[PDB]
Design a protein around this ligand. Structure first.
Ligand SMILES: OCc1cccnc1
Ligand SMILES: OCc1cccnc1
Lengths: 251, 251
């Protein structure tokens, strides 16, 4: 795969843009300056084979980059990236990881370290499917743990309920491995939104299948629990992309 | 008003971010590098009194920053910033001025010149109500003029049909003064979308008032014309943010 060109310049550019102009009244500023964050990020992966990375590789970078998150606004998602982000609305309705400083800086970028100077490759990177799971998930897995650990109040979880091959909730997903296990006692409730795509067969419903397993697990951790299927605001958002779908008929 | 801090750092950061990572599959890159674009932008207003500007001040910047735009996808808007951008969906369905390089770079920034060194005022900018009209609209007026000139095929125009103090179409708005006048023979149709805010009194309707004047202007330039009010895709977006509104009742 082809890595992102001029990684350091893109990183520093997004970091200064974020500092001075993004989420100004939504998320707090980070104390470390952009060059200090870059040194920490770069130390985490440079001069290492990518298959040797693990969940602790980026721990110091995330400690430096972590922002306190607003009460009741954190959202988690699985299988519905586009819809969850449209609904979150750039921090106005809900906060996603991609709105936080580290999530915004690295979103969609591709990078890799190497053992030989200068310690990273800006022209070619080995496919990562070849690497062990803890390395493949080193960065975004640590990103999720740190983000989830900072949540307070009610948290929201948006899932896909029309995928016959991928259950709504799975223990091996990022939500299962990194987010749910890191929710602290400052969290009070997990609110689930099950998305049923327009014109597709309905597969998962609240109170049954993997969603019933999720409910049990959440209660076992003493969090309150609730679940809704295509709530109106979410349905309207789906209808805007397919206004003639039968589920979108107006009076 | 308060000037944006670290203006040059923010300008250059956004420029590099855009160049390497933004709108890669919808808009072409420009050929100038970020430092050359900064030089052009800066000389337009630097070392001059804060009100000494006209439509030609940023001429070199806009020439260097202009991109060829996708046929049938250009959208213009008046009085409905949030609704138009949410509907265009960051270049998905339509492109807006704020998705192009110069628009992305300066969106929401505040800046002004002064004669004394460093040539720009880092502490305060005029109420721009204190500056004559050709100065006040120097930057965004030239941005809109250059943008309109590059549009091709069908163009779309979203306006507010519920503002009793301001008509849907005004000859002195940026669309009326800088955009409509710069549409070329390569435009073939102007498609108007009239926004009727939820729960508010309808002020303008297709086929009447300022919209009838607009139709007369469009036809004189030999372009086809059509106008619709709250088309389904837009209504659903309005309803998503206000699901209990009466216009959103389901069958
Ligand atoms: O590449 C961007 C990205 C990957 C995974 C999770 N969130 C953002
Ligand atoms: O400040 C950003 C801006 C002003 C006017 C029009 N479009 C964008």
């Amino acid at each position: 795969i082809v890595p992102t060109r001029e990684l350091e310049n893109v990183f520093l550019g997004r970091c200064k843009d974020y500092e001075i102009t993004r989420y100004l009244d939504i998320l707090p500023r980070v104390r470390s300056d952009c060059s200090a964050l870059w040194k920490d990020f770069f130390k985490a992966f440079s001069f290492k084979n990518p298959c040797d990375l693990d969940l602790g590789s980026y721990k110091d970078f995330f400690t430096s980059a972590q922002q306190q998150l607003p009460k009741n606004k954190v959202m988690f998602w699985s299988g519905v990236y586009d819809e969850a982000h449209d609904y979150a609305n750039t921090g106005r309705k809900y906060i996603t990881l991609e709105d936080t400083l580290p999530g915004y800086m690295l979103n969609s970028l591709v990078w890799c370290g190497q053992r030989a100077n200068p310690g990273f490759n800006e022209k070619v990177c080995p496919d990562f499917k070849t690497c062990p799971v803890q390395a493949r998930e080193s960065f975004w897995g640590m990103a999720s743990s740190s983000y989830a650990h900072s949540a307070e109040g009610e948290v929201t979880y948006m899932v896909d309920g029309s995928n016959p091959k991928v259950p709504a909730y799975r223990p091996d997903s990022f939500f299962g491995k990194y987010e749910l296990p890191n929710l602290t006692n400052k969290v009070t409730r997990v609110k689930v939104i099950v998305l049923h795509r327009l014109g597709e067969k309905i597969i998962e419903k609240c109170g049954a299948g993997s969603l019933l397993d999720l409910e049990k697990l959440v209660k076992a951790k003493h969090f309150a629990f609730d679940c809704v299927e295509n709530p109106r605001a979410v349905l309207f958002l789906l209808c805007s992309d397919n206004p003639n779908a039968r589920e979108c008929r107006l009076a």
